[PDB]
Amino acid sequence: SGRLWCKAIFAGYKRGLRNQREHTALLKIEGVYARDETEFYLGKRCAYVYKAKNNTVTPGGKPNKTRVIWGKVTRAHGNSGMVRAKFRSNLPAKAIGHRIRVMLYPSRI
Amino acid sequence: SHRKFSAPRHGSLGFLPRKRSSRHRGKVKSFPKDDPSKPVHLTAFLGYKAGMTHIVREVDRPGSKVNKKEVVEAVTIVETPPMVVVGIVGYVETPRGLRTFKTVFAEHISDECKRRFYKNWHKSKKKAFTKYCKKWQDDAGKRQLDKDFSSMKKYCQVIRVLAHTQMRLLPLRQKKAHLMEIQVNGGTVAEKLDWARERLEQQVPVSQVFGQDEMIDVIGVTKGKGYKGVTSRWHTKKLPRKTHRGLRKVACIGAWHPARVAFSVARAGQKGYHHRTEINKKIYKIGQGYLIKDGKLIKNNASTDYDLSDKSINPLGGFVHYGEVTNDFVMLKGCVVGTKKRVLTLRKSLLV
Amino acid sequence: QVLVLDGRGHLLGRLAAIVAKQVLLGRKVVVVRCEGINISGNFYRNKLKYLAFLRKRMNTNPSRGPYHFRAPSRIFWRTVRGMLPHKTKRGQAALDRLKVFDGIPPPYDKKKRMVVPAALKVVRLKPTRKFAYLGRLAHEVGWKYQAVTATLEEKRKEKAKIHYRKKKQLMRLRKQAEKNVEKKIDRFTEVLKTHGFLV
Amino acid sequence: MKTILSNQTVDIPENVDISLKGRTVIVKGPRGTLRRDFNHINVELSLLGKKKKRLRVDKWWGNRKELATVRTICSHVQNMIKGVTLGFRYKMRSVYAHFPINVVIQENGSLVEIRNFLGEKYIRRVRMRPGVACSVSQAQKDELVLEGNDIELVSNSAALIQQATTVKNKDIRKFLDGIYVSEKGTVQQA
Amino acid sequence: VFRRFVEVGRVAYVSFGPHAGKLVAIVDVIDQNRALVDGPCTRVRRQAMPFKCMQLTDFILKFPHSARQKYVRKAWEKADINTKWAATRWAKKIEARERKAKMTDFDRYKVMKAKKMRNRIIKNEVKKLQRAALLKAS
RNA sequence: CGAAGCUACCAUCUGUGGGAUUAUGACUGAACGCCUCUAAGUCAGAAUCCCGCCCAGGCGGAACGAUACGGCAGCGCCGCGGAGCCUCGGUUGGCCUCGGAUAGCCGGUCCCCCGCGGGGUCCGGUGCGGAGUGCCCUUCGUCCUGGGAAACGGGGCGCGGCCGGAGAGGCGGCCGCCCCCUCGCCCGUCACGCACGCCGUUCGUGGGGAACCUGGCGCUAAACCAUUCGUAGACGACCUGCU
RNA sequence: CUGCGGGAUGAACCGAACGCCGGGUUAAGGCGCCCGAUGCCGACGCUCAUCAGACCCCAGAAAAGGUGUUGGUUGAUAUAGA
RNA sequence: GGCUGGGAAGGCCCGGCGGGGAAGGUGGCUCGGCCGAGUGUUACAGCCCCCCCGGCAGCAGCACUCGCCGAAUCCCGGGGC
Ligand SMILES: [Mg+2]
Ligand SMILES: [Mg+2]
Ligand SMILES: [Mg+2]
Ligand SMILES: [Mg+2]
Ligand SMILES: [Mg+2]
Ligand SMILES: [Mg+2]
């Protein structure tokens, strides 16, 4: 009946100054601003939800315009609560600074 | 290398968007500063350049060789028939600027003023302000107008009045009136608003705001001269006769290292028809137009205390390319911008 | 979902960096009262720096040259733009999310505005150091609407004083009403103070 | 280095009543009331003892530059107390060789006009700071008296009327003309 | 206008560090920003502690500036610093923060229901008082 | 010899005010019991800089008028309904004092002053902020009846009046009349496709743009071309006239 | 004849040398924003510039001065009173 | 496990020796109601601190985390990719 995912922001890809690696994304989870609260979110499933012109299938429902790219939290990123994530397909780079929902049910607590 | 002999540059960099003026009527860029101690008054008027003539006057400057000596000075005649107030406009101060707050028009609008609202009067159905005048003759409209006046009184700080010229009284071919906002400077906002509301649908003579021997500002557009060369546009030096590729040019457009020609380099283009604002124009005489009590009264135009004749300012055969001056006129010392029939904006001095 | 920040007492670059970083993350940020921005160093230093910036112009055509905006809000906007990749589409999209105002406009005059302690002068600057106000600097380099902004801010502060007086009356009556019916809420108050409330 | 503690005390008379609004000293007495805001100085302004007999200023962990403020605030308070009790009177004499200096007060003492300075046809109208009243001194051929409660304003007005009478484009060592302050005292000596 | 001073025997509260959230007493001053500290009754040994990580309360017990960890403990026990600290609003607020930290979801639901009833009762009383005040004004 | 028009310091007219300060000269005042333009603070200060006056006017806004009666038509406001293409962000809100930092917040104000409120003195409570954004506000299952505490609250884009709000108001506050419901907290009482573990669930949204199906209240054109004129002009453009 | 990371930029500098990839860790360099990372409750001091300063090659300064400020060395006199 | 066969510290302390901050003391002075607070001077210890003689389990690189080097003098368990 409510929200069961944490808010996160697609900050960008794993990169140096002049080289970009698109197979690993950087996530900014709201409320986490240290490399000590990220242990909870390790291994959590994350999805990027978006809509498109054509209809697609929907598990347990009628076809809709929503498509997602599923992912997984891998490790923390540099003392600031940033989280590295890997998706089955690399993010479109259109979602930079957009909403990414990290699920809560790879539960291990 | 430096130029061998120094010479001041030709033209002024402060006047050189040299484009044909977007507007035909002169525009007051800045009205006189408003202080709430003097009574309410207007600060602008519209006239028409009629012609030029002579004048004879004794000088009263001690120490000069011309003291107590009669002189001949050029004076220009500007016919100024009275204007009709048709509406008022309010403004509010803003950190971004000064935007208009509300505009209220009068119940009755002359056809001359309605001419300005249509590009093709012949093909138009003349439907302008047909539903607006219903406000002035209905209780709901009257209440709305009262609320508008109250809001302008409460919020506005700058009040301007819309007035149009009476082209019927001029001998010009055109019949479309010129409409201009005139800022009212005087007491408090409420007093100025009430005074402007009283003057609605009323004629304002030129003698009310302008007086004799007063310095004023004249605003208008220059005579158009079309495309002109750099020799005439900027008064540059002419190349000698031996020049092959033209001598009415500028030899060195620019240097090498900056691979562009600067905006300060004189070039050919449009000359004339530029908006200008001259300062310190003195009113030698404010004339009274033709009036009839028993017959025609034509003496007052050109009769003086020493001539006492029945002359009018109109020369024999009338003014050249203008016509006959019949309404009130203002005599300014010297010359003013614009050609004949050109509408001129008369503005009060911005300085003490 | 929109950040509104009060610019009074905040350092220029310290606030600009944080605002730019938040704006790049898709956050909508509104900066208010940009005349309260202050810059480190004495007033003459910053005056000379802005005059030196004013000297920068294209020799052949100053119209195409740098645009020297005089309003304090536009000065802050340019400083923030200097910290963004404004040449790219992403930078322009981020910069569209930023919104600055001189004074406090009516759309935001009835909103609570946050402050950033990491950009405040009282925190980041020594009490013995000198600083310059952005409003005075702007007024001396071409700004036109300092007095109008001051008058409007005075009126807004009077209105806010009226509202704050009403809020004080409401809160005092709330506190008294809590005392009046304290017996009927004893069990509700005990459980609240058991878990760390009202203590 | 940093000095652990530096302090100084001012012993005010029983006539003067002093109060502090945190770091703003308000001094009132027989002649009037003087206000001076001591912000931007970062000192501990303490008013100790009954009847407010003594005023103490403290400075904790201050370097060499911040240390002089402790003495300068005490000096300012002493001057303010002296002005509120006795006041400040500045006597200045006009010096000339050939052209006599004609000085006339205009409104009460605020507007002062100087005429016939080195034969100049120009007349200087000099406005003085509020609270200071000028007058033409008696028992002296050419002397002016400046009176007020605040020493700063009286001295600033005296400097203004000193700099008004300045010789230009000539040897100032030879042309020793103008009005110069001759005595810095109090209105009442007691 | 200062009411808190770094005095020998001043009780200080440690904001952060190894001994965070534990009372301690100042023994001697080492430098400008470092002092010798001792916490015998609060499980804190004698070692240097910077002034940055300590916020000192309004409790001052008297003992010599270089006592050997034995007389400071005796003074702490005689003054009964623990009970006085527990009676202060500061410790109560700290305990309220800890209780909020340790609150479980069931306790959160109970608090939600309690606030749901209490705020409604209080706001009804506030509305009645506002109506009475408006009646009195007229 | 010469009209009109162009034209010449070869004729005639016009050419402006503030702010911050540089150099410099000063006031108060230590460092350094004295002295000092400087350290804190303050004054005067110019062909300097900025602005005003002046010229142009933003992929910048504002107010106002008329808004296509036609021989086919097409619109503008209101409410409540149906599919039908494109485009996306989201996944409760906070409706607000001024403000200082070697200080501040809250009441009563016995006392005084000023226009229910504001200001001052005094007094009493907190200040690592519980009148804390380390925060507050709302619950996020439904329905039956069956008890206690609390209680006249809410709704029908509920219908009509009084206002505040003009910086870029675009939102709310205060009163009258009809009908309907027993909503918040604790326990009894069952029933709600219980779809038999599997993902985009849950909303702001009746979202925004374009085209078509219901009604009530108001509409009647202007712009351009063509022609005409020269205050205009290379051509465009510009100033004008025409039941 | 040589790509790659850093020095903003780049012959020769620093690191390190090349098949197509996944994971982890480093060098030289960095961690306010552009721009990945100090969003450490970092430590100790110095510095106010109306020409501040900010990292080999490298992109700029000398002699001589300053009671501006912060430390050190030496030498005297001061309760027989500086 | 080793070390300075760890350095200090904690508790009962006992029989002593000297020295120094300068205190339930004295005292010129100052601030309030004999007391409370602030300065100086010779200065024993009834506020203490330090060295020398000597001895008790109470230790342990100590979850009172004041600073080491470590691993046949070392093993177990869990989480993520
Ligand atoms: Mg969705
Ligand atoms: Mg030359
Ligand atoms: Mg040839
Ligand atoms: Mg000036
Ligand atoms: Mg000045
Ligand atoms: Mg100076």
Side-chain angles (χ1 to χ4, degrees), chain A residues 5 45-59 63-72 86-92 94-95 99-103 105:
Chain A
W5 40 267
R45 199 180 187 188
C46 60
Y48 164 60
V49 184
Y50 65 99
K51 291 181 295 182
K53 173 182 175 301
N54 294 127
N55 291 338
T56 50
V57 209
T58 299
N64 307 122
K65 292 185 176 182
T66 64
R67 298 97 169 272
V68 305
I69 302 179
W70 289 104
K72 176 194 300 181
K86 293 184 63 63
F87 297 79
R88 290 198 294 266
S89 63
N90 299 9
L91 295 182
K94 181 191 60 177
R99 185 61 69 201
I100 288 185
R101 52 180 71 173
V102 40
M103 307 304 177
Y105 47 79

Side-chain angles (χ1 to χ4, degrees), chain C residues 1 8 33 44 47 51 70 101-107 109-114 122 130 136 140-142 144 152-153 156-157 159-161 163-165 167-168 171-172 175 184 188 197 199:
Chain C
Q1 71 285 346
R8 189 188 63 86
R33 196 188 300 182
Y44 207 87
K47 181 76 167 301
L51 291 181
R70 315 301 171 93
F101 298 97
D102 287 320
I104 306 189
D109 94 90
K110 297 183 181 301
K111 303 294 183 59
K112 178 177 297 299
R113 50 204 71 92
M114 313 299 175
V122 66
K130 293 185 178 181
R136 177 193 174 185
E140 298 188 9
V141 301
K144 305 283 192 55
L152 295 185
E153 283 299 320
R156 192 267 308 172
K157 287 182 296 181
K159 301 296 180 57
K161 178 66 62 177
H163 166 82
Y164 165 72
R165 170 194 315 167
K167 182 180 178 300
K168 291 184 77 179
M171 180 56 181
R172 171 164 31 90
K175 183 178 178 299
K184 298 163 54 181
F188 305 94
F197 279 143
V199 176

Side-chain angles (χ1 to χ4, degrees), chain C residues 46-89:
Chain C
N46 306 322
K47 181 76 167 301
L48 290 182
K49 290 191 300 181
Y50 198 89
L51 291 181
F53 169 67
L54 281 174
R55 297 193 190 98
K56 265 69 176 180
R57 69 171 193 172
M58 180 179 295
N59 181 85
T60 57
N61 192 13
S63 299
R64 308 169 73 103
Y67 299 145
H68 317 82
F69 288 85
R70 315 301 171 93
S73 57
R74 303 312 298 173
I75 293 179
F76 179 78
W77 182 92
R78 188 182 179 91
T79 57
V80 173
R81 189 197 75 176
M83 309 182 183
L84 296 172
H86 67 110
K87 293 299 182 61
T88 62
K89 303 294 296 183

Side-chain angles (χ1 to χ4, degrees), chain B residues 161 269-270 286-287 312:
Chain B
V161 61
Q270 168 73 18
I286 300 181
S312 304

Side-chain angles (χ1 to χ4, degrees), chain E residues 30-50:
Chain E
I30 308 302
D31 204 74
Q32 154 126 24
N33 47 13
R34 205 161 62 101
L36 186 63
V37 98
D38 190 37
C41 297
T42 55
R43 303 199 303 105
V44 181
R45 287 171 185 172
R46 172 168 295 190
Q47 79 279 346
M49 182 177 295

Side-chain angles (χ1 to χ4, degrees), chain B residues 15 17 19-20 22 24 29-30 93-96 99-101 103 105 115-116 118-120 122 125-132 154-155 173-176 223-227 270 273 275-277 279-281 321 333 339 341-342 351:
Chain B
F15 280 101
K19 56 181 300 181
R20 207 176 298 109
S22 60
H24 186 75
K29 302 295 182 60
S30 59
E93 271 67 17
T94 305
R96 289 186 295 178
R99 73 166 188 87
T100 171
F101 185 78
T103 304
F105 281 88
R115 292 291 189 99
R116 183 59 60 179
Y118 294 94
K119 304 299 298 180
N120 194 325
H122 172 63
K125 205 57 65 63
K126 308 160 184 54
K127 206 62 63 62
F129 289 90
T130 298
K131 284 81 179 180
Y132 183 84
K154 178 181 178 179
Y155 298 112
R173 161 191 171 91
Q174 67 165 345
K175 307 174 184 177
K176 188 180 302 179
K223 294 163 61 64
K225 303 185 182 305
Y227 202 106
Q270 168 73 18
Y273 206 77
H275 186 275
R276 293 293 181 264
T277 301
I279 195 184
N280 292 332
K281 296 300 180 179
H321 281 93
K333 180 197 177 185
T339 180
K341 313 184 186 64
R342 180 64 51 79
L351 312 172

Side-chain angles (χ1 to χ4, degrees), chain D residues 1-189:
Chain D
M1 64 173 185
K2 296 292 183 177
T3 302
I4 169 180
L5 169 61
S6 178
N7 63 91
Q8 186 180 352
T9 174
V10 177
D11 196 327
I12 93 171
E14 71 185 82
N15 302 328
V16 182
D17 299 328
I18 59 177
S19 300
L20 33 87
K21 188 182 177 58
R23 210 152 70 259
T24 300
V25 182
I26 46 181
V27 175
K28 58 182 302 300
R31 295 203 57 172
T33 305
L34 292 179
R35 285 85 174 274
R36 180 183 285 263
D37 190 8
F38 284 114
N39 272 264
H40 67 66
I41 213 69
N42 300 118
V43 306
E44 183 178 8
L45 191 63
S46 178
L47 192 54
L48 49 87
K50 296 187 62 179
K51 312 177 307 302
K52 312 307 180 60
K53 185 174 61 61
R54 293 176 299 178
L55 178 65
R56 183 183 61 183
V57 293
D58 302 328
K59 180 60 181 178
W60 305 91
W61 306 111
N63 51 26
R64 178 176 180 85
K65 307 303 292 297
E66 299 167 6
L67 219 63
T69 65
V70 182
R71 179 68 182 275
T72 205
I73 186 179
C74 290
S75 301
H76 286 72
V77 171
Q78 289 279 9
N79 281 126
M80 179 156 47
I81 293 179
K82 181 188 298 296
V84 83
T85 295
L86 305 178
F88 294 94
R89 177 156 57 184
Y90 278 62
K91 298 186 303 178
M92 40 207 311
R93 296 270 296 173
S94 73
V95 183
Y96 51 85
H98 184 74
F99 298 104
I101 301 179
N102 184 25
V103 41
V104 178
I105 50 182
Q106 189 67 25
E107 300 182 357
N108 298 322
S110 299
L111 190 56
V112 183
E113 57 175 8
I114 309 300
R115 300 182 179 181
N116 196 256
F117 176 79
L118 276 304
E120 292 180 359
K121 298 291 115 180
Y122 177 65
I123 303 179
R124 278 95 68 170
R125 284 78 151 83
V126 41
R127 181 71 61 178
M128 308 187 314
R129 297 287 90 97
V132 186
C134 184
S135 181
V136 277
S137 179
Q138 208 55 43
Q140 294 286 346
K141 181 186 62 177
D142 294 316
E143 193 185 33
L144 295 178
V145 41
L146 277 302
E147 296 179 4
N149 292 334
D150 191 10
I151 176 181
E152 299 265 14
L153 306 181
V154 180
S155 305
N156 188 84
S157 59
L160 287 172
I161 52 192
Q162 274 199 82
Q163 294 192 186
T165 61
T166 305
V167 181
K168 292 299 184 303
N169 304 124
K170 270 177 176 56
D171 192 0
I172 192 59
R173 301 176 295 109
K174 174 64 178 180
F175 292 84
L176 294 175
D177 302 322
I179 308 180
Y180 311 97
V181 174
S182 59
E183 185 266 359
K184 300 184 179 63
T186 60
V187 178
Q188 181 181 8
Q189 295 183 353

